[PDB]
């Protein structure tokens, strides 16, 4: 059994990225399905800044974490990520192997990098050579 709302919040302190800006690489729509998971919320609790709250549904996450609050909430995200506490979670969302590895290693830039490199929405689905004449004939055709 797990599901522990650990109320041990004595300090506060999100840990964002200085080189790779998390808010410009990760958008609310990507974070929403993740943060809507109460399990990740558990891991974000120790890093939850003062005044911030954890939205339950993706829609309200978008409403609350528009930009200022988003950078703060994403900062606690990367904070739990840096600790590796948020690592195993990434695989359960169907996230890139490189991203889940990064989340376990606690590398926030690698996560952000691998996210938009692998979850890159260009709909590349179906790489198979059962079509395309990449080797053609020369005579008449």
Number of Cα atoms under 13 Å in the Cβ half of residue 32: 14
Which residues have a Cβ under 8 Å from the Cβ of 111 and sit 6 or more positions away?
Answer: 78, 81, 90, 99, 102, 103
Q: Any idea which residue has 């549904």 for tokens?
A: 57
Correct CATH for 1-121 of 3.40.50.970, 1.10.2020.20, 1.10.8.60, 3.40.190.10: 1.10.2020.20
CA dihedral 68, 72, 77, 78 (to 10 degrees): 100
Helix axes 28-35, 68-82, angle to 10 degrees: 60
DSSP letter for each residue of 70-100: HHHHHHHHHHHHHTTTTTGGGGGGT--HHHH
Round to whole Å and give the CA distance between 32 and 60.
9
């Amino acid at each position: 059994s797990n599901a522990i709302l650990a109320t041990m919040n004595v300090p506060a302190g999100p840990a964002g990225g200085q080189q790779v800006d998390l808010a410009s690489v990760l958008t609310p729509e990507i974070m929403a399905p993740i943060l809507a998971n109460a399990d990740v919320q558990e891991r974000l609790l120790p890093y939850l800044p003062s005044g911030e709250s954890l939205p339950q549904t993706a829609d309200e996450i978008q409403n609350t974490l528009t930009s200022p609050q988003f950078q703060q909430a994403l900062g606690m995200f990367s904070a739990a990520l840096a600790s590796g506490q948020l690592g195993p979670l990434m695989c359960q969302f169907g996230l890139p192997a490189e991203a889940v590895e990064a989340a376990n290693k606690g590398d926030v830039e690698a996560f952000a990098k691998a996210m938009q490199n692998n979850a890159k929405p260009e709909q590349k689905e179906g790489d198979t050579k059962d079509k395309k004449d990449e080797e053609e004939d020369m005579s008449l055709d």
